[PDB]
Amino acid sequence: EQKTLHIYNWTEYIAPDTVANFEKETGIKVVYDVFDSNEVLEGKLMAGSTGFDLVVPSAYFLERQLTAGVFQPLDKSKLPEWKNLDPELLKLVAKHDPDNKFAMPYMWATTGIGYNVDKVKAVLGENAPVDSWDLILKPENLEKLKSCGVSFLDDPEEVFATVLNYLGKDPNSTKADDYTGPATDLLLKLRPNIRYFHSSQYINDLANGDICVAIGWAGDVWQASNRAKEAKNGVNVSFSIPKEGAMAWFDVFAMPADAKNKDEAYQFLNYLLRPDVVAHISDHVFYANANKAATPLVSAEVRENPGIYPPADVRAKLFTQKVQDPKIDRVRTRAWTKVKSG
Ligand SMILES: [Cl-]
């Protein structure tokens, strides 16, 4: 009569005592495993027989697998606190997961600009355009910021979509020439001023003062900012969702089709739906959760931060990723190699 539950989630994406609290309440043995690379997660899910009862993919990946039999539909009768989830956010996630059949939204954020407040102002002045992609996508600005250090993500899907939106095009353009032409043109003009393309080095580099501007995931940047504060190192890190808009994305809990410990998994999911549980997570990880009942319980410093919980005018400028034809996938990979070579 041992009860067990196997979970696979991102690093830095739960509160330190969430699992311990759940174990004390339920008597379930939780085996909590972490990944730091989306490629690692998706490769395991596609191979199957992962041994996980719960996993945390992107809503975008879930869309790609809706007919592949990777996941199983969630039994809402075992999730009595489902009503706490924000219907407005559920509708957006339903673009990827019709009728919210497979996924329980967990946390969500944007891809924006993380930056060192003091260094940016030293280089570009007090009126530096921190509210705009101009800060890092105007070559004249990036040339000045080069010495204090510029990082881009190593993700052509996010970066091309960001550049296309900045150029006034469909962020999800289906036209190959938009990628190989104007988007690559701008990226090649910026390239000489970019120190590196990497998925995670920018977090600690922002916190320690080694880079001054980065394309980054909001909550990871806010984590860096908090780490700098705790270190009492004088580094002031902030984050901007720029005025031209930005990519929004949603991390979700889902259940592999071969999950064994289904009752325990639903217990954990409904535990996450308790307002104080997920509010406590957001307090620790600096990400907005999808639970509207939880918002008033989140610490004021987090819920009042419009780069974590953006208001309606900002949300209306955000775009989400669409699935492309594989021809466009290959275009993006080829063009990204060209960009990075310079
Ligand atoms: Cl997503």
Numbering used by the authors: 28 to 369
What does the report in the manuscript say about this coordinate set?
To gain insight into the evolution and designability of ligand binding and specificity, we analyzed the homologous PBPs, PotF and PotD, which are Escherichia coli putrescine (PUT)-binding protein and spermidine (SPD)-binding protein, respectively. They constitute the first elements of two separate multicomponent uptake systems (PotFGHI and PotABCD) to transport the cationic polyamines PUT and SPD across the cellular membrane. Still, the protein-binding modes differ: PotF shows affinity for PUT and SPD, whereas PotD exclusively binds SPD. Prior to this work, we grafted the seven differences in amino acids from PotD binding pocket onto PotF; this resulted in PotF_SPD, which will be referred to as PotF/D throughout this work to keep naming for mutants more concise.
Hence, the focus shifted toward D247S, the wildtype Asp bears one of two major carboxyl groups important in primary amine coordination upon ligand binding and recognition in PotF. We introduced the S247D exchange into PotF/D and into our high-affinity constructs E39D–Y87S–F88Y and E39D–F88A/L. PotF/D–S247D showed an improved SPD affinity in the regime of the first-round salt bridge construct (KD(SPD) ≈ 9.4 μM; Table 2). Nonetheless, all constructs regained PUT affinity in the medium to low micromolar range. This was expected as we reintroduced the wildtype-like proximal primary amine–binding site in these variants. All structures but PotF/D–S247D adopt a fully closed wildtype conformation. All in all, we determined salt bridges and the key carboxyl-harboring proximal residue D247 as the basic prerequisites for a complete closure of PotF constructs. Fixing each component by itself was not sufficient. Only the combination of both allows full closure, deeming it an intricately regulated process.
